[PDB]
Structures are given as structure tokens and as C-alpha cells.
Design an enzyme around this catalytic site. Structure first.
Site, mmCIF file in Angstrom:
data_model
loop_
_atom_site.group_PDB
_atom_site.id
_atom_site.type_symbol
_atom_site.label_atom_id
_atom_site.label_comp_id
_atom_site.label_asym_id
_atom_site.label_seq_id
_atom_site.Cartn_x
_atom_site.Cartn_y
_atom_site.Cartn_z
ATOM 1 N N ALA A 1 -9.847 -2.454 20.291
ATOM 2 C CA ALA A 1 -8.101 -2.476 19.042
ATOM 3 C C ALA A 1 -8.515 -1.719 17.882
ATOM 4 C CB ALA A 1 -7.992 -3.435 18.740
ATOM 5 N N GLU B 1 -8.883 -6.107 5.781
ATOM 6 C CA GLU B 1 -9.101 -6.792 7.384
ATOM 7 C C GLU B 1 -8.746 -8.281 7.229
ATOM 8 O OE1 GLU B 1 -10.728 -5.751 9.416
ATOM 9 O OE2 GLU B 1 -10.666 -3.841 8.275
ATOM 10 N N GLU C 1 -4.264 -6.718 13.801
ATOM 11 C CA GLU C 1 -3.912 -5.210 13.894
ATOM 12 C C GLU C 1 -2.844 -5.095 13.457
ATOM 13 O OE1 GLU C 1 -6.157 -3.138 14.040
ATOM 14 O OE2 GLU C 1 -7.977 -4.301 15.602
HETATM 15 N N1 LIG Z 1 -11.461 -7.969 22.077
HETATM 16 C C1 LIG Z 1 -11.634 -7.348 20.052
HETATM 17 C C2 LIG Z 1 -11.122 -6.660 19.028
HETATM 18 C C3 LIG Z 1 -11.202 -5.736 17.304
HETATM 19 C C4 LIG Z 1 -10.498 -6.210 17.337
HETATM 20 C C5 LIG Z 1 -10.621 -5.099 14.889
HETATM 21 N N2 LIG Z 1 -10.770 -3.972 15.464
HETATM 22 C C6 LIG Z 1 -11.480 -3.256 14.374
HETATM 23 C C7 LIG Z 1 -11.563 -2.040 14.467
HETATM 24 C C8 LIG Z 1 -12.120 -1.066 13.344
HETATM 25 C C9 LIG Z 1 -12.444 0.741 13.570
HETATM 26 C C10 LIG Z 1 -12.215 1.407 11.874
HETATM 27 C C11 LIG Z 1 -12.361 2.848 11.646
HETATM 28 C C12 LIG Z 1 -11.940 3.184 13.158
HETATM 29 C C13 LIG Z 1 -11.630 2.675 15.135
HETATM 30 C C14 LIG Z 1 -12.044 1.240 14.544
HETATM 31 C C15 LIG Z 1 -10.660 -3.368 13.265
HETATM 32 O O1 LIG Z 1 -11.139 -3.999 12.555
HETATM 33 O O2 LIG Z 1 -8.991 -3.475 13.462
HETATM 34 C C16 LIG Z 1 -12.895 -6.190 15.190
HETATM 35 O O3 LIG Z 1 -13.850 -4.554 15.583
HETATM 36 N N3 LIG Z 1 -12.707 -6.883 14.804
HETATM 37 C C17 LIG Z 1 -11.454 -7.697 14.516
HETATM 38 C C18 LIG Z 1 -12.801 -9.187 13.465
HETATM 39 C C19 LIG Z 1 -13.908 -8.348 14.063
HETATM 40 C C20 LIG Z 1 -13.864 -7.422 14.548
HETATM 41 C C21 LIG Z 1 -14.755 -7.870 16.288
HETATM 42 O O4 LIG Z 1 -13.974 -7.323 17.028
HETATM 43 O O5 LIG Z 1 -15.959 -7.255 15.714
HETATM 44 ZN ZN LIG Z 2 -9.318 -5.189 11.004
#
Ligand SMILES: NCCCC[C@H](N[C@@H](CCc1ccccc1)C(=O)O)C(=O)N1CCC[C@H]1C(=O)O
Ligand SMILES: [Zn+2]
Ligand SMILES: [Cl-]
Ligand SMILES: [Cl-]
Length: 574
Positions: free
Chosen positions: A315, A372, A345
């Protein structure tokens, strides 16, 4: 000279919007349709945007920022002098871009197969196994398999990646890539600040750790759980043991108080990925915030494609830099965990929309952590038992502790993990950790901070960090540690602004215009001012602080100490 400066900024802004918009397109097409064709086009678009960056970056460096009067012009120009990867000689730049591309692809297409032919992808297959299986060997198969296939496959690319990203950093004035990343916070005391924050949440984490360890001992047997040692990394209900929400059933404080099957409820009444984002969109507008544009629903990929194309499921929210086109890319699964992700998101999208009129160089959060935190803040309210019941997904002291435990399994368990990721990368970047010790130092930290141990001894060739999205994708992680601390600070302030009284965990800021107004004024600043100002606008004070989070969980901390004490738990892992 000052006149030449404002003119430069204007030209930089109008030309950047066009080039960045085009790059966003190619990058999107690749992420939503991994093919050799889209790959080729993306890598070509890389060179084009790098060309623009070098052109203006070279010009920006000719200005003596020290002599610039206008602070906004001064701030923008100083930022444009950092070419990032575009600072690398043509040869190294193409190699670096391909390296990044290959790591991302390798991770997103990796599968773990059984002796037959049944191969599982990370999402949702392996993810479901880690969340629902209660069989030690089945969890181990998925845990080890994922690392054997994704982790080991990234190792061949990492040393070169580290060399090139560090080189780029040095060419931009920093000592290494870690230095460059930390600079995004414009806070010299950053490392010490974060260390103090981590230490303040230790009592709470250590108590949660001991309680969960006891429950695991109860379920998996005394021969598999050392009551005075680390917890095997595959038993927490999550591939990386970063959140332990999925083993709530094994640790429920008061089992006599049954909780509805949230996932079963969503499915039972036809919730769809679209419904999920619509609910999130509704929460934002209820606060008086902006709704996502109609174009969002038409261009976003809210479901895993089923037309034969491979995509990057992880995501993410996208800003196409034209102040009109924003999208989310998520292979959404219908459950509570992904409902929170959807809000996370949508929080990014809201930020994109709030600062869309600022010069492009300033179109970022006060600091990465702020970007975030937004979605998570709203999701905190959404998660309340009462709010979930209003969505018809759910149907008192004991209920409070049960709820706080569910929240802690997610928020508190994540603290040490979110802290650890970049502590490892910063040391890889500064050369303290060589490719000979990548994995061993990763596990030394996993133990030191999370109190976890690998269920299977690691061997030469393993590269477990590569099995975590952000590593091969080169996305900084400290922003998540910062986010989890400040999101509670935001929740506390917004709740007070909303007139909430009583326990903080019972607060639901749904449709509070006062709350929404503070978030809006802060988000509108983008990256135009030092983050402490945005912090002040929301909370009335300028520092990061664990107080809000500790206050939120105070009841649980007291319950945990009493529970661990009567069972004679030895906190930590000697
Ligand atoms: N079930 C998976 C949900 C993922 C959602 C979230 N996604 C990420 C994406 C990061 C990104 C930046 C630039 C290019 C491509 C991607 C987010 O921060 O939205 C995330 O990674 N998060 C949200 C909280 C912590 C961190 C994780 O899960 O380690
Ligand atoms: Zn994020
Ligand atoms: Cl790991
Ligand atoms: Cl960051």
C-alpha cells in the site's frame, strides 16, 4: 541577485511540476503492471527527471544562500542544491536506478512454494498464515520460507546499493546516506531525542512483552518458550513481528468478555475495499477536511488486479504534482487491519491536497513523521469499540483493558521495531556494519530492542532485512517511530480541542470541526517552516513527547504490572 533568485524559484517550480508529473506516471504504470516494457520506460523517465534535477541543481548551487534575504526563496534554493541521486555520474546513476528497480521487483514477485506446486505470495497468502496459524511448524515454514526467497534474493544487490546511495550522499554534502536521511528532520539532536523517547516507552513495552511471552508459553509449551528469554520471531501473528494484534485471542485479558469477529462482520455484511476508503473519506470530511477528488476513485487501484498483470501490492499513496491527480495503490483485503491501512494512506492523500498550492520543493510534511501520523490519528478514533459498533462491526473496566490490550499489541509492540530498522541502516550507511555482518547485527538489534530471537539459526547467505519491504525499496523507516509517538500527541490535543473529557482512550474525534481545523492549518504549512511550528499549532507546545502515548495506555500499564507481578515475571531477557 535577490531578483534572480525568485525568478529561478518560479522557473524551477513550473518546470518541476511537468517533469515530476510525467515521472509519477511512468512510475505508477510500472508499480501497477510490472512488465519489461514498463520497466524500460520508467528507467528512461529516471534519466529525464535526473537531467532536470541536474540542470536546476547546478544553477541553485551558484547562489550564495547566505546572502539571500527572502527566507522562503533561501529555503527552496538550499533544498534544490541537493541533487540526490542525480549527483551521480551518468554511469553510476543508471546502475543505481537499475539496482533499485531490481530490488523492488525481486521483493514484489517473490513466492514461497510447497513440494507440490502450491506457491504463496506475501499478500495475502503468507500474511494470512502468519496471522491465523497456531502451529509452530506451519508458522516456521512461512517465516523461514519468506526470508529464504525474498531476503536471500536481495543480498546480491545490497552492497552495491549501499555504495551508490552513499556516494550520492557525499556528492551532495553529507557524510553518508544515513546522514542525508536524518537531515530531513532538520534536528541536530535527533538521535538523542529518539533515544530518550524509546527509553520512556520501555517500561510499557517490557511489561507487554513479558505478558505475551507468558501467554505464548501457555499455548506453545514450556519446551518452546523461555520465560526469561527472547520470544521466537514467528509467533506474533505478523511476518516481522512488528505488530502483535493478530494473536489477541491468545492473550485476551478478560476472555469472559467476548469480542465480535470484526473480519467476519465486515465480510458478513458485504464490506468492499471501496466501502473501506469511502468510510475513511467520510471521516476526513466529517472533520471539515477535504474529500478526495472524483478522479481519485477512477484512477486508484484499491484491489489486487486479476487480469494477469503483476503489481507492487504494498500500500502507498501517490501525488502526481498537478494539484489534481492523487491516488492510492493497495491490494486491499477486507478486514480491520487493512481498514486502518486505508485510513493511513488516505491521511497521505489529505496532506497532498492540503499543501498542493505551495512551491513543489516545499510540498512535504513538516517532517516525514507528520506525513505518516495523519491517517493514524483518525484511525485511532475509528478503532474505539463504540465507533466500530457504529459501523456495525462490534456489539466497563474489563472491556477497557481488553481494548487497550488490542491497541497495545499494535502501537506499543511497534515502537521497538520502528526504532530498530534505521538504527541498523544508519550503521550500514556509516560503514559500521559490513556485508559480512549485515544479518548478525540485524539480529543483535532484534534482540536488544524487541527481545526476539530467530526460531531457526541464521546461516551465511541469509539477509533477513531484505525480507522487509522498506529495505529493498529504500524507504526510510524512522518516520514510523516518530509517527507512533506524535500521533498520540495529536490524538490528545485534538480530543481536548473537541471537548473530550475522561480517559483519553475513550475519545472519538468523529466530526469535530475544531479538531479538523488544527490539522488543516498544520498540514497547509507543508515543509515551509521548521516542524516544531506545526507541532505547536496542533498541540500547543513544540516538542515530541511520549507523555500522550503513556497517558493513553496508563490503565493498561497498571494492569500489566499487577498481572506480571502476581505471576512473578522477570522483565526483559538476561
Ligand atoms: N499491510 C501493509 C500495509 C503497508 C502500509 C504502509 N505503506 C507505506 C509506503 C511507503 C512507500 C514510500 C515511497 C514509495 C513506495 C512506498 C506508507 O508509508 O504509506 C506502511 O509500510 N506502513 C504503515 C505503518 C508502518 C509501515 C509498515 O507496514 O511497515
Ligand atoms: Zn505512510
Ligand atoms: Cl527478520
Ligand atoms: Cl524518515
Amino acid at each position: 541577485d535577490e531578483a534572480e533568485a525568485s525568478k529561478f524559484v518560479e522557473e524551477y517550480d513550473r518546470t518541476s511540476q511537468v517533469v515530476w508529473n510525467e515521472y509519477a506516471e511512468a512510475n505508477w504504470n510500472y508499480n501497477t503492471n510490472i512488465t519489461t516494457e514498463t520497466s524500460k520506460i520508467l528507467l528512461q523517465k529516471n534519466m529525464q527527471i535526473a537531467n532536470h534535477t541536474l540542470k536546476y541543481g547546478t544553477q541553485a548551487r551558484k547562489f550564495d544562500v547566505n546572502q539571500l534575504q527572502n527566507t522562503t526563496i533561501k529555503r527552496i534554493i538550499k533544498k534544490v542544491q541537493d541533487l540526490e541521486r542525480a549527483a551521480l555520474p551518468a554511469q553510476e546513476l543508471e546502475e543505481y536506478n537499475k539496482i533499485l528497480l531490481d530490488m523492488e521487483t525481486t521483493y514484489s514477485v517473490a513466492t514461497v512454494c510447497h513440494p507440490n506446486g502450491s506457491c504463496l505470495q506475501l499478500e495475502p497468502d503468507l500474511t494470512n498464515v502468519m496471522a491465523t496459524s497456531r502451529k509452530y511448524e506451519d508458522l516456521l515454514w512461512a517465516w523461514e520460507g519468506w526470508r529464504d526467497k525474498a531476503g536471500r534474493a536481495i543480498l546480491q544487490f545490497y552492497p552495491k546499493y549501499v555504495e551508490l546511495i552513499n556516494q550520492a550522499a557525499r556528492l551532495n554534502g553529507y557524510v553518508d546516506a544515513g546522514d542525508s536521511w536524518r537531515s530531513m528532520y532538520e534536528t541536530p539532536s535527533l538521535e538523542q531525542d529518539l533515544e530518550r523517547l524509546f527509553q520512556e516507552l520501555q517500561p510499557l513495552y517490557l511489561n507487554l512483552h513479558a505478558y505475551v511471552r507468558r501467554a505464548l508459553h501457555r499455548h506453545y509449551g514450556a519446551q518452546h518458550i523461555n520465560l526469561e528469554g527472547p520470544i521466537p520471531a514467528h509467533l506474533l501473528g505478523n511476518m516481522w513481528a512488528q505488530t502483535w494484534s493478530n494473536i489477541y485471542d491468545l492473550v485476551v485479558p478478560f476472555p469472559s468478555a467476548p469480542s465480535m469477529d470484526t473480519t467476519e462482520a465486515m465480510l458478513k455484511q458485504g464490506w468492499t475495499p471501496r466501502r473501506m476508503f469511502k468510510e475513511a473519506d467520510d471521516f476526513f470530511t466529517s472533520l471539515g477536511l477535504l474529500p478526495v477528488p472524483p478522479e481519485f476513485w477512477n484512477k486508484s487501484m484499491l484491489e489486487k488486479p486479476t487480469d494477469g498483470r503483476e503489481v507492487v501490492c504494498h500500500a502507498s499513496a501517490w501525488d502526481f504534482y498537478n494539484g489534481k491527480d492523487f491516488r492510492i495503490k493497495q491490494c486491499t483485503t477486507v478486514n480491520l487491519e487493512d481498514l486502518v491501512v486505508a485510513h493511513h494512506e488516505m491521511g497521505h492523500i489529505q496532506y497532498f491536497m492540503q499543501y498542493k498550492d505551495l512551491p513543489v520543493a516545499l510540498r512535504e510534511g513538516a517532517n516525514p513523521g507528520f506525513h505518516e501520523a495523519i491517517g493514524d490519528v483518525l484511525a485511532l478514533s475509528v478503532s474505539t469499540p463504540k465507533h466500530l459498533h457504529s459501523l456495525n462491526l462490534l456489539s466497563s473496566d474489563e472491556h477497557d483493558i481488553n481494548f487497550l490490550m488490542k491497541m497495545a499489541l499494535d502501537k506499543i509492540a511497534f515502537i521497538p521495531f520502528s526504532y530498530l530498522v534505521d538504527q541498523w541502516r544508519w550503521r550500514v550507511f556509516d560503514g559500521s556494519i559490513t556485508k559480512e555482518n549485515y544479518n548478525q547485527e540485524w539480529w543483535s538489534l532484534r534482540l536488544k530492542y524487541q527481545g526476539l530471537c530467530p526460531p531457526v539459526p541464521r546461516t551465511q547467505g541469509d539477509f533477513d532485512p531484505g525480507a522487509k519491504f522498506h529495505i529493498p525499496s529504500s524507504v526510510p523507516y524512522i518516520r514510523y517511530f516518530v509517527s507512533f509517538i506524535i500521533q498520540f500527541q495529536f490524538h490528545e490535543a485534538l480530543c481536548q480541542a473537541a471537548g473530550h473529557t475522561g480517559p483519553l482512550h475513550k475519545c472519538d474525534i468523529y466530526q469535530s470541526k475544531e479538531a479538523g481545523q488544527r490539522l488543516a492549518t498544520a498540514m497547509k504549512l507543508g515543509f515551509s517552516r521548521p516542524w516544531p511550528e506545526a507541532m505547536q499549532l496542533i498541540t500547543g507546545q513544540p516538542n515530541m513527547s511520549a507523555s500522550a502515548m503513556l497517558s493513553y495506555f496508563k490503565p493498561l500499564l497498571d494492569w500489566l504490572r499487577t498481572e506480571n507481578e502476581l505471576h512473578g515475571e522477570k522483565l526483559g531477557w538476561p
